[PDB]
Amino acid sequence: KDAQAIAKDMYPGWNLGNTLEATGSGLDAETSWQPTLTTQQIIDAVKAAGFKSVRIPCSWDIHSDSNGEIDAQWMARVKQVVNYCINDGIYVVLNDHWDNGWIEVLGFSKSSSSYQAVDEATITSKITRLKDLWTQIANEFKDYDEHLLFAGLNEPFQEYSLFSGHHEELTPILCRYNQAFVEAVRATGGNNAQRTLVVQGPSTNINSSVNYMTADKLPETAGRLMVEVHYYDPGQFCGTFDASGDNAFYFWGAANHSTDHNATYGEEAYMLSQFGLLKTAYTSLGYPVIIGEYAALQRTISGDQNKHNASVKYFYQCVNEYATNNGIIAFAWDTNDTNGLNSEGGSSTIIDRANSAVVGNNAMEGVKAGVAAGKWPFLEHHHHHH
């Protein structure tokens, strides 16, 4: 089944956050940034809640030896986690994540502390490492069917203090990396020739992506390729910046404002506009898009708790409704932080992994409502049964 075919069955998505991407060297890294060892029961709970796809952030360079070989025990563990999903018919988006910045930062600057332009030797060196890691991964997973997707990178050059203002310069480099990932995986043949692969836009940023990474620059024609961006506007509601205290947003959506801590930008019209850009650039041209991460903070607040809860619901609802309508699959960022939900600072956690249950009921209700309201657009060249 090709990208259009799987996309329509993929929404809504969920992330196994703060898990396999942690930058530890051992299998214990899985429980280093969150507490709960993944199990089949946990993944069953993700399905039971209504999610159809799981993105698995995963680090690999950090689990490699000095010759670049990925630890066999790490690889076996990632495969077990993938298999929990595949056993349930869940689609999996397995990536290479920040991974201590080996490419996310150092593919684009020669320094992690200040911006120092890379040269051809750096770029070709990073291409070769990227193809090495992806050859290993792809070969390991070669016999998995279309339920397994690979995503080559995560948030290329997202680090603002280094890369702000350099997106035009850096996007052509990212296009080379994305092409390298695709080439390496396709070369391994077998199901890997036919698997849908996911390439990332500049800073996984909508505006930069649709500007600098137009469809003619993608590494394959439409068919078995998707494009990934992330979506965290407005950051004071979503958790990326200025998101606790006086500058935080607790209320979101025209109908949900309260006494104070109201979102002042980034509400429903803004979201719709942004998602529309992705339709125009990619999904209308036969490249499904994944919003690989999004979230809102669910908090406990001293003000109007019901209005905050409604705001969280409504945000998840809008993301998933507007994504579906635009041929976009959205994946909730969830780090299994149950305690933050009981504080002003909040948490985006929906699944209580330790109890294999939903604890983020407002967010979850919103996801469900959004998916239900959405109408997936079909871009076909032949009759399908429907």
Tab-separated table of C-alpha atoms in Angstrom:
chain	number	residue	atom	x	y	z
A	1	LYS	CA	0.000	0.000	0.000
A	2	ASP	CA	1.328	3.453	-0.924
A	3	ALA	CA	1.358	6.784	0.925
A	4	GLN	CA	-2.184	7.811	0.060
A	5	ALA	CA	-3.415	4.388	0.946
A	6	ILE	CA	-1.872	4.248	4.429
A	7	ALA	CA	-2.408	7.953	5.231
A	8	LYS	CA	-6.160	7.673	5.253
A	9	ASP	CA	-5.890	4.966	7.933
A	10	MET	CA	-3.204	6.687	10.024
A	11	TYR	CA	-4.997	9.435	11.925
A	12	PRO	CA	-4.888	10.249	14.763
A	13	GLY	CA	-1.289	9.837	15.849
A	14	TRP	CA	0.523	9.679	19.203
A	15	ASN	CA	4.229	9.965	20.185
A	16	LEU	CA	6.131	7.594	22.469
A	17	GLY	CA	7.827	10.714	23.856
A	18	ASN	CA	10.851	10.962	26.162
A	19	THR	CA	11.460	7.279	25.603
A	20	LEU	CA	13.691	5.680	22.973
A	21	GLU	CA	15.184	9.041	21.953
A	22	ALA	CA	16.789	9.702	25.333
A	23	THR	CA	20.586	10.304	24.927
A	24	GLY	CA	21.781	7.490	27.169
A	25	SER	CA	24.124	4.779	25.988
A	26	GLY	CA	22.298	1.729	27.306
A	27	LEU	CA	18.911	-0.017	27.143
A	28	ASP	CA	18.164	1.835	30.382
A	29	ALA	CA	17.949	5.030	28.341
A	30	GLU	CA	14.314	3.982	27.671
A	31	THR	CA	13.368	4.877	31.268
A	32	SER	CA	15.739	7.744	31.856
A	33	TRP	CA	13.608	10.718	30.765
A	34	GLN	CA	10.293	9.057	31.785
A	35	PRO	CA	9.688	6.268	34.257
A	36	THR	CA	7.790	3.440	32.588
A	37	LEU	CA	9.259	0.538	30.584
A	38	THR	CA	7.214	0.127	27.389
A	39	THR	CA	5.011	-2.943	27.162
A	40	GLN	CA	2.421	-4.484	24.893
A	41	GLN	CA	-0.269	-3.496	27.439
A	42	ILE	CA	0.762	0.208	27.137
A	43	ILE	CA	0.586	0.131	23.370
A	44	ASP	CA	-2.768	-1.660	23.574
A	45	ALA	CA	-3.994	1.298	25.680
A	46	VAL	CA	-2.814	3.752	23.023
A	47	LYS	CA	-4.888	1.848	20.446
A	48	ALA	CA	-7.889	1.537	22.802
A	49	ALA	CA	-7.903	5.312	23.280
A	50	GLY	CA	-8.353	5.659	19.502
A	51	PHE	CA	-4.895	6.350	18.082
A	52	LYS	CA	-4.075	4.668	14.798
A	53	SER	CA	-0.334	5.506	14.495
A	54	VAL	CA	2.573	5.794	16.877
A	55	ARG	CA	5.607	7.921	16.241
A	56	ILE	CA	8.692	6.540	17.925
A	57	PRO	CA	11.419	9.097	18.469
A	58	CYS	CA	14.585	7.074	18.569
A	59	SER	CA	18.271	7.727	18.974
A	60	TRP	CA	20.801	5.627	17.156
A	61	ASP	CA	24.111	7.449	16.833
A	62	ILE	CA	24.185	7.597	20.706
A	63	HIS	CA	23.764	3.767	20.716
A	64	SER	CA	26.604	3.255	18.198
A	65	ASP	CA	30.192	2.099	18.830
A	66	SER	CA	33.323	3.820	17.545
A	67	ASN	CA	32.980	2.115	14.171
A	68	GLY	CA	29.480	3.421	13.860
A	69	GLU	CA	27.722	0.124	14.431
A	70	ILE	CA	24.431	0.278	16.351
A	71	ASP	CA	24.411	-1.861	19.516
A	72	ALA	CA	22.689	-5.135	18.703
A	73	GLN	CA	20.844	-5.267	22.040
A	74	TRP	CA	19.525	-1.683	21.431
A	75	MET	CA	18.379	-2.641	17.970
A	76	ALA	CA	16.613	-5.718	19.344
A	77	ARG	CA	14.829	-3.628	21.940
A	78	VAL	CA	13.618	-1.013	19.408
A	79	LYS	CA	12.323	-3.923	17.275
A	80	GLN	CA	10.372	-5.290	20.245
A	81	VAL	CA	8.754	-1.871	20.797
A	82	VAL	CA	7.900	-1.592	17.114
A	83	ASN	CA	6.442	-5.090	17.249
A	84	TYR	CA	4.022	-4.089	20.090
A	85	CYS	CA	2.573	-1.662	17.590
A	86	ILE	CA	2.659	-3.870	14.538
A	87	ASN	CA	0.965	-6.637	16.578
A	88	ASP	CA	-1.937	-4.256	17.018
A	89	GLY	CA	-2.127	-3.007	13.470
A	90	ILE	CA	-0.793	0.369	14.509
A	91	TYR	CA	1.240	2.316	11.962
A	92	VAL	CA	4.712	3.215	13.184
A	93	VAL	CA	6.805	6.236	12.292
A	94	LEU	CA	10.323	5.299	13.464
A	95	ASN	CA	12.802	8.129	13.247
A	96	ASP	CA	16.332	9.279	14.081
A	97	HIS	CA	15.673	12.029	16.638
A	98	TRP	CA	17.797	14.892	18.015
A	99	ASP	CA	20.179	12.124	18.985
A	100	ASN	CA	22.598	14.533	20.796
A	101	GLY	CA	22.688	16.763	17.780
A	102	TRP	CA	25.008	14.720	15.615
A	103	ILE	CA	23.205	15.884	12.494
A	104	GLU	CA	20.330	18.081	13.802
A	105	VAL	CA	22.937	20.594	14.912
A	106	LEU	CA	26.309	19.450	13.597
A	107	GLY	CA	24.999	18.761	10.063
A	108	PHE	CA	24.496	22.503	9.792
A	109	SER	CA	27.098	24.200	12.027
A	110	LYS	CA	30.671	23.116	12.746
A	111	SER	CA	30.095	24.247	16.353
A	112	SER	CA	27.321	23.464	18.842
A	113	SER	CA	28.038	26.876	20.662
A	114	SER	CA	27.906	29.304	17.799
A	115	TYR	CA	26.975	29.319	14.160
A	116	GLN	CA	29.968	28.268	11.991
A	117	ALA	CA	29.077	27.475	8.416
A	118	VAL	CA	29.694	23.884	7.329
A	119	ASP	CA	31.613	23.007	4.190
A	120	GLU	CA	31.506	20.212	1.702
A	121	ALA	CA	33.677	17.889	3.793
A	122	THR	CA	31.240	18.165	6.704
A	123	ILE	CA	28.198	17.620	4.507
A	124	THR	CA	29.580	14.617	2.700
A	125	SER	CA	30.797	13.151	5.997
A	126	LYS	CA	27.306	13.554	7.487
A	127	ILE	CA	25.701	12.055	4.394
A	128	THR	CA	27.874	8.977	4.767
A	129	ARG	CA	27.094	8.571	8.492
A	130	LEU	CA	23.385	9.084	7.867
A	131	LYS	CA	23.406	6.415	5.146
A	132	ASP	CA	25.350	4.041	7.417
A	133	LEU	CA	22.829	4.347	10.262
A	134	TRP	CA	19.869	4.061	7.905
A	135	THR	CA	21.326	1.031	6.113
A	136	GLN	CA	21.577	-0.728	9.430
A	137	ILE	CA	18.068	0.222	10.470
A	138	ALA	CA	16.480	-0.512	7.154
A	139	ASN	CA	18.175	-3.897	6.881
A	140	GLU	CA	16.979	-4.854	10.368
A	141	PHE	CA	13.402	-3.935	9.558
A	142	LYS	CA	13.433	-4.986	5.945
A	143	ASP	CA	10.591	-7.529	6.264
A	144	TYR	CA	8.060	-5.225	7.929
A	145	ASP	CA	5.147	-4.209	5.720
A	146	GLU	CA	3.716	-0.764	5.008
A	147	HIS	CA	2.628	-0.393	8.684
A	148	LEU	CA	6.296	0.643	9.349
A	149	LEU	CA	7.384	4.081	8.038
A	150	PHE	CA	10.852	5.592	8.533
A	151	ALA	CA	11.566	9.326	9.171
A	152	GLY	CA	15.200	10.219	8.464
A	153	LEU	CA	15.686	13.235	10.772
A	154	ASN	CA	13.685	15.123	13.415
A	155	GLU	CA	13.901	18.948	13.686
A	156	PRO	CA	16.842	19.921	11.416
A	157	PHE	CA	18.440	23.251	12.442
A	158	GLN	CA	15.627	24.085	14.840
A	159	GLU	CA	18.027	25.472	17.430
A	160	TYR	CA	17.093	29.178	17.311
A	161	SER	CA	20.163	30.708	18.838
A	162	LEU	CA	22.332	29.065	16.180
A	163	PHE	CA	20.120	28.906	13.097
A	164	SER	CA	17.540	31.676	13.191
A	165	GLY	CA	17.854	33.711	9.990
A	166	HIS	CA	19.799	30.922	8.202
A	167	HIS	CA	16.931	28.787	6.891
A	168	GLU	CA	17.301	29.810	3.249
A	169	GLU	CA	21.047	28.982	3.394
A	170	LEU	CA	20.569	25.698	5.172
A	171	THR	CA	17.510	24.186	3.428
A	172	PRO	CA	19.579	22.938	0.412
A	173	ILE	CA	21.794	21.085	2.786
A	174	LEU	CA	18.815	19.492	4.474
A	175	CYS	CA	17.517	18.504	1.009
A	176	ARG	CA	20.782	16.601	0.523
A	177	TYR	CA	20.415	14.822	3.829
A	178	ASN	CA	16.782	13.906	3.167
A	179	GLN	CA	17.836	12.534	-0.242
A	180	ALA	CA	20.604	10.549	1.348
A	181	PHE	CA	18.224	8.926	3.798
A	182	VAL	CA	15.816	7.992	1.004
A	183	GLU	CA	18.614	6.578	-1.209
A	184	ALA	CA	20.014	4.448	1.554
A	185	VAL	CA	16.723	2.961	2.545
A	186	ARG	CA	15.528	2.341	-1.063
A	187	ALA	CA	18.845	0.591	-1.888
A	188	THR	CA	18.146	-2.132	0.663
A	189	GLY	CA	15.210	-3.185	-1.480
A	190	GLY	CA	12.581	-5.661	-0.387
A	191	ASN	CA	9.792	-4.020	1.438
A	192	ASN	CA	12.116	-1.011	1.854
A	193	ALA	CA	11.740	-0.151	-1.817
A	194	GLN	CA	7.968	0.197	-1.306
A	195	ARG	CA	7.752	1.526	2.323
A	196	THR	CA	6.510	5.114	2.803
A	197	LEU	CA	9.376	7.356	4.015
A	198	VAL	CA	9.005	10.684	5.769
A	199	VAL	CA	11.360	13.609	5.130
A	200	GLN	CA	11.569	16.695	7.365
A	201	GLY	CA	11.212	20.381	6.455
A	202	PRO	CA	13.573	23.124	7.577
A	203	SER	CA	13.282	23.524	11.394
A	204	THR	CA	10.126	21.393	10.910
A	205	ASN	CA	8.665	24.897	10.411
A	206	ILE	CA	5.593	25.415	8.156
A	207	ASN	CA	6.572	28.861	6.889
A	208	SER	CA	10.154	27.918	6.074
A	209	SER	CA	9.149	24.572	4.607
A	210	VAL	CA	6.605	25.894	2.142
A	211	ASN	CA	9.017	28.659	1.141
A	212	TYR	CA	12.342	26.870	0.711
A	213	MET	CA	11.367	23.233	0.444
A	214	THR	CA	8.883	23.189	-2.392
A	215	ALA	CA	7.649	19.880	-3.742
A	216	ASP	CA	10.051	19.962	-6.751
A	217	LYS	CA	12.906	19.718	-4.213
A	218	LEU	CA	11.711	16.587	-2.519
A	219	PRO	CA	13.863	13.511	-3.126
A	220	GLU	CA	11.135	11.413	-4.913
A	221	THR	CA	8.017	12.088	-6.886
A	222	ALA	CA	4.689	11.591	-5.041
A	223	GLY	CA	3.741	8.028	-4.270
A	224	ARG	CA	5.578	6.720	-1.219
A	225	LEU	CA	6.805	9.884	0.511
A	226	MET	CA	5.471	12.109	3.223
A	227	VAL	CA	6.681	15.488	4.580
A	228	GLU	CA	6.994	16.318	8.259
A	229	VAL	CA	6.600	19.547	10.195
A	230	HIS	CA	5.968	20.186	13.871
A	231	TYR	CA	3.394	22.598	15.327
A	232	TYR	CA	3.682	24.242	18.675
A	233	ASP	CA	1.982	27.662	18.179
A	234	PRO	CA	1.236	29.479	20.432
A	235	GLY	CA	4.190	28.434	22.560
A	236	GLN	CA	2.838	29.838	25.773
A	237	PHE	CA	-0.136	27.456	25.508
A	238	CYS	CA	1.734	24.531	23.904
A	239	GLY	CA	4.757	24.486	26.188
A	240	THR	CA	7.698	25.607	24.093
A	241	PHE	CA	8.388	29.043	25.648
A	242	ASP	CA	7.146	31.478	28.271
A	243	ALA	CA	4.633	28.791	29.207
A	244	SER	CA	4.345	29.010	32.964
A	245	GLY	CA	3.689	32.102	35.144
A	246	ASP	CA	2.353	35.464	34.120
A	247	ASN	CA	3.135	35.113	30.397
A	248	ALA	CA	1.570	31.602	30.102
A	249	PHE	CA	-1.630	30.902	28.212
A	250	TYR	CA	-4.342	28.876	29.930
A	251	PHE	CA	-7.233	29.755	27.655
A	252	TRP	CA	-7.420	29.309	23.924
A	253	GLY	CA	-10.072	29.717	21.309
A	254	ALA	CA	-12.437	32.653	20.781
A	255	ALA	CA	-15.146	31.085	22.916
A	256	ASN	CA	-12.908	30.129	25.802
A	257	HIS	CA	-11.276	33.297	27.072
A	258	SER	CA	-11.308	34.138	30.777
A	259	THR	CA	-10.018	36.704	33.243
A	260	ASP	CA	-6.318	36.564	32.404
A	261	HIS	CA	-3.671	34.246	30.800
A	262	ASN	CA	-5.634	34.387	27.497
A	263	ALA	CA	-3.960	33.435	24.222
A	264	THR	CA	-3.415	36.652	22.276
A	265	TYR	CA	-2.312	34.961	19.007
A	266	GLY	CA	-2.184	31.578	17.415
A	267	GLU	CA	-5.859	30.708	17.755
A	268	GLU	CA	-8.133	28.865	15.431
A	269	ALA	CA	-7.921	31.072	12.343
A	270	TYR	CA	-4.156	31.177	12.601
A	271	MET	CA	-4.024	27.353	12.872
A	272	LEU	CA	-6.334	26.914	9.913
A	273	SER	CA	-4.220	29.300	7.809
A	274	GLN	CA	-1.005	27.457	8.651
A	275	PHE	CA	-2.440	24.040	7.896
A	276	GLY	CA	-3.762	25.456	4.594
A	277	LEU	CA	-0.167	26.332	3.608
A	278	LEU	CA	0.716	22.599	3.979
A	279	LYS	CA	-2.228	21.605	1.791
A	280	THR	CA	-1.120	23.998	-0.869
A	281	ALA	CA	2.541	23.001	-0.788
A	282	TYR	CA	2.398	19.239	-0.227
A	283	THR	CA	-0.876	17.427	0.336
A	284	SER	CA	-2.591	18.812	-2.784
A	285	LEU	CA	0.464	17.617	-4.697
A	286	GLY	CA	0.203	14.013	-3.477
A	287	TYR	CA	2.586	14.176	-0.470
A	288	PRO	CA	0.744	13.506	2.739
A	289	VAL	CA	1.977	15.557	5.661
A	290	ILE	CA	2.565	14.488	9.213
A	291	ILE	CA	2.519	17.001	11.995
A	292	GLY	CA	5.014	14.854	13.823
A	293	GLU	CA	4.559	16.672	17.147
A	294	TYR	CA	2.012	19.035	18.619
A	295	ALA	CA	0.694	19.522	22.180
A	296	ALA	CA	-1.094	21.779	24.609
A	297	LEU	CA	-0.400	21.859	28.275
A	298	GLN	CA	-3.105	20.429	30.509
A	299	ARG	CA	-2.731	22.161	33.833
A	300	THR	CA	-4.263	22.614	37.236
A	301	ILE	CA	-4.943	26.317	37.755
A	302	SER	CA	-6.281	28.613	40.390
A	303	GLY	CA	-8.758	30.362	37.940
A	304	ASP	CA	-11.484	28.879	35.789
A	305	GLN	CA	-10.442	25.249	35.534
A	306	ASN	CA	-13.396	24.312	33.379
A	307	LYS	CA	-12.517	26.930	30.796
A	308	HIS	CA	-8.908	25.797	30.780
A	309	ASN	CA	-10.012	22.179	30.324
A	310	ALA	CA	-12.313	23.268	27.484
A	311	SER	CA	-9.407	25.125	25.914
A	312	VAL	CA	-7.252	22.003	25.956
A	313	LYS	CA	-10.072	19.947	24.437
A	314	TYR	CA	-10.763	22.543	21.789
A	315	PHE	CA	-7.089	22.819	20.820
A	316	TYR	CA	-6.751	19.018	20.275
A	317	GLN	CA	-10.034	19.098	18.473
A	318	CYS	CA	-8.959	21.903	16.063
A	319	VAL	CA	-5.568	20.249	15.382
A	320	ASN	CA	-7.107	16.978	14.471
A	321	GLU	CA	-10.133	18.365	12.611
A	322	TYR	CA	-8.144	20.839	10.574
A	323	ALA	CA	-5.356	18.313	9.965
A	324	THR	CA	-7.768	15.700	8.696
A	325	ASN	CA	-9.465	18.161	6.416
A	326	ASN	CA	-6.094	19.136	4.896
A	327	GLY	CA	-4.710	15.591	4.407
A	328	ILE	CA	-2.447	15.893	7.418
A	329	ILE	CA	-1.924	13.252	10.187
A	330	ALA	CA	-1.160	14.861	13.536
A	331	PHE	CA	0.837	13.117	16.309
A	332	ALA	CA	0.342	14.209	19.986
A	333	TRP	CA	3.529	14.775	21.953
A	334	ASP	CA	3.294	12.740	25.135
A	335	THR	CA	6.162	12.221	27.617
A	336	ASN	CA	4.393	10.251	30.367
A	337	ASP	CA	4.558	13.024	32.934
A	338	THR	CA	1.441	12.460	35.027
A	339	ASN	CA	2.503	14.747	37.867
A	340	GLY	CA	2.761	17.889	35.775
A	341	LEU	CA	-0.961	17.643	35.082
A	342	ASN	CA	-1.428	18.539	38.779
A	343	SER	CA	0.431	21.822	38.582
A	344	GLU	CA	0.210	25.174	36.936
A	345	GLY	CA	3.125	24.305	34.717
A	346	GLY	CA	1.110	21.443	33.192
A	347	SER	CA	1.865	18.462	31.049
A	348	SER	CA	0.847	17.268	27.565
A	349	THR	CA	0.500	13.717	28.805
A	350	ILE	CA	-2.552	11.818	27.657
A	351	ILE	CA	-1.605	8.203	28.470
A	352	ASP	CA	-0.812	7.179	32.031
A	353	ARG	CA	1.643	4.404	31.006
A	354	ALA	CA	2.107	3.012	34.415
A	355	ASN	CA	-1.630	2.256	34.520
A	356	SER	CA	-2.264	1.673	30.817
A	357	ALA	CA	-5.058	4.238	30.880
A	358	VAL	CA	-6.034	7.676	29.653
A	359	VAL	CA	-5.465	10.441	32.227
A	360	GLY	CA	-5.546	13.402	29.772
A	361	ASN	CA	-9.272	13.171	29.187
A	362	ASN	CA	-9.746	16.668	27.876
A	363	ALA	CA	-7.014	16.340	25.239
A	364	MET	CA	-8.269	12.810	24.323
A	365	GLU	CA	-11.878	13.914	24.006
A	366	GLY	CA	-10.640	16.667	21.761
A	367	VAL	CA	-8.653	14.312	19.553
A	368	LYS	CA	-11.692	12.075	19.163
A	369	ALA	CA	-14.029	14.987	18.418
A	370	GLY	CA	-11.594	16.456	15.895
A	371	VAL	CA	-11.104	13.214	13.996
A	372	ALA	CA	-14.895	12.710	13.915
A	373	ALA	CA	-15.485	16.204	12.472
A	374	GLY	CA	-12.775	15.969	9.910
A	375	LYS	CA	-13.189	14.811	6.278
A	376	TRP	CA	-10.057	13.205	4.842
A	377	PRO	CA	-9.400	14.336	1.243
A	378	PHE	CA	-8.676	11.558	-1.220
A	379	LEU	CA	-6.214	12.192	-3.998
A	380	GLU	CA	-6.520	9.222	-6.310
A	381	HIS	CA	-5.643	8.226	-9.850
A	382	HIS	CA	-7.763	5.131	-10.003
A	383	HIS	CA	-10.998	3.927	-8.422
A	384	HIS	CA	-10.904	2.737	-4.860
A	385	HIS	CA	-13.684	0.863	-3.114
A	386	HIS	CA	-14.404	3.219	-0.299
